[PDB]
Design a protein around this nucleic acid. Structure first.
Lengths: 19, 101, 64, 64, 90, 49, 63
DNA sequence: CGATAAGCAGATCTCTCGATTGCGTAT
DNA sequence: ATACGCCTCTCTGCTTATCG
RNA sequence: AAUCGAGAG
């Protein structure tokens, strides 16, 4: 749980597209 | 939802691209300032101390700052200085593009 | 790999014989103090100084 | 400062403002009523200034 | 089984300064596999198409040499990245 | 089930998990408390949002 | 009195009459951008003068 | 409105020691 | 023995007044 | 923690 093994912030670019 | 983030990211990238000064018209000193030299040496020394790859022949040396000074002498430091103008606009000079002293 | 020659000697010398070392900071932030240890303990710690990290979360780090 | 514990965020700027009474009650952990801090036997009193909801106090686990 | 393109802010160790793609993978993406992530929606099957957002906006995206922003008080570099995550959630 | 958290008192909450970590002094935190005692709030804007 | 019209309130608050400069900062909802050396020392940011006048980027080889 | 006679406010390096810190009272 | 409430020698600048 | 007193540059 550190800035060396997990991303700082995560955001969604678009809506989830089903494949 | 996410599209709010997409708009914010687009705006951030657009403002960043507007602030950047293209290489063809940067009007700052060709020489590396003493402050830039000191910080390049310190940051490169930190990176070497944290087990980064090194681009010079270690003459049996152990001081990371000395290794960084050797890299600067041989112009092998993969760093870039981003000089900031008062308005927030910035230029980008590579280390090998600058002349020390 | 370029520091172990003299950092190992500092750890062996310990907190009293200059040049020496007072602490070892592990990859996971542990602070092993050499103040109350004996010569053989310090020698074992100095020999296990540059050991490859087993934890994935700290493979980017080395002891201090 | 440990150079092996990088921080991702950074305080860009700060803005001054008024702490409104609604948000003060919204974020709070306990209301302080009785003007006694410690009872006999040296223990905090519930609702007092040294309430365990305001933080740990002399080997007492914080209740928040 | 849904593709969720995401953008993340991830640190980069000085040891992976020659292959930042592998650095980002082994630092943030591999420990994001077979875990329920609170953001994407569900467990993550895998990832593909990692891209590093260059810190200099002028350079065209064609180039493979990019810039990473180094923390002032640390040799770790932080950068925005784009990647498409394969997810599963009810 | 993800954004629900508990206190020691058991009061369940569902809310702000958008919290990060910064590198500040500690007298800054004490100044924040002394300002809150004055009824003054300080908002700190973090770089990455 | 000769420094009242300044953009950074932390500088004046550190200087003197901390109460008055804080009241005027909060009444106007002043948002100082942490630029004066005093403000960064209050908040714990690398200064802007000298070796803080620029930033440092790493030229990573592979995209 | 205004021009003083007047009133009020906040100012005017670092470091080492020791000694003392509150009196009357009602039950 | 003791537990609640009681204890006269500098300076500039901002601000209000007040009286013909 | 203050206050007083003694010092050092």
């Amino acid at each position: 749980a550190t800035t060396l093994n997990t991303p700082v912030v995560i955001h969604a670019t678009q809506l989830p597209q089903h494949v | 939802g996410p599209e709010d983030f997409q708009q914010h990211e687009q705006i951030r990238r657009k403002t960043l691209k507007e602030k950047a000064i293209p290489k063809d018209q940067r009007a700052t000193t060709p020489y590396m300032t003493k402050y830039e030299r000191a910080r390049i040496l310190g940051t490169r020394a930190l990176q070497i101390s944290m087990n980064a790859p090194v681009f010079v022949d270690l003459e049996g040396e152990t001081d990371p700052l000395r290794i960084a000074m050797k890299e600067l002498a041989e112009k092998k430091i993969p760093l870039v200085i981003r000089r900031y103008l008062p308005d927030g606009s910035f230029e980008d000079w590579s280390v090998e593009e600058l002349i020390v002293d | 790999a370029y520091n172990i020659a003299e950092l190992r000697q500092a750890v062996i010398n310990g907190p009293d014989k200059w040049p020496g070392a007072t602490q070892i900071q592990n990859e996971d932030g542990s602070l092993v103090s050499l103040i109350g240890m004996s010569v053989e303990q310090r020698k074992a710690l100095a020999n296990q100084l540059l050991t490859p990290s087993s934890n994935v979360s700290t493979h980017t780090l080395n002891k201090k | 400062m440990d150079i092996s514990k990088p921080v991702g965020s950074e305080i860009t700027s700060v803005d001054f403002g008024i702490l409104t009474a609604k948000e003060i009650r919204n974020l709070s952990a306990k209301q302080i009523t009785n003007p006694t801090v410690l009872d006999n036997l040296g223990h905090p009193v519930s609702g007092g200034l040294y309430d365990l909801a305001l933080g740990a106090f002399l080997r007492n686990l914080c209740s928040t | 089984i849904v593709r969720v393109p995401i953008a993340l802010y991830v640190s980069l160790a000085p040891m992976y300064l020659e292959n930042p793609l592998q650095g980002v993978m082994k630092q943030h993406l591999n420990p994001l596999v077979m875990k329920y992530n609170n953001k994407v929606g569900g467990v993550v099957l895998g990832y593909e198409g990692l891209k590093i957002l260059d810190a200099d906006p002028l350079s065209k995206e064609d180039t493979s040499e990019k810039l990473i922003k180094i923390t002032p008080d640390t040799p770790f570099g932080f950068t925005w990245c784009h990647v498409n995550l394969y997810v599963w959630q009810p | 089930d993800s954004q629900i958290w508990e206190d020691g008192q058991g009061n369940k909450f569902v809310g702000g998990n958008e919290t990060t970590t910064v590198a500040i002094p500690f007298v800054l935190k004490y100044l924040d408390s002394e300002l809150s005692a004055m009824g003054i709030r300080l908002r700190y804007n973090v770089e990455p949002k | 009195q000769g420094m009242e019209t300044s953009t950074s309130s932390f500088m004046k608050m550190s200087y003197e009459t901390t109460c008055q400069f804080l009241t005027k900062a909060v009444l106007d909802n002043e948002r100082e951008q942490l630029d004066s050396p005093s403000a960064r020392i209050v908040v714990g940011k690398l200064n802007n003068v000298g070796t803080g006048s620029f930033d440092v980027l790493a030229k990573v080889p592979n995209a």
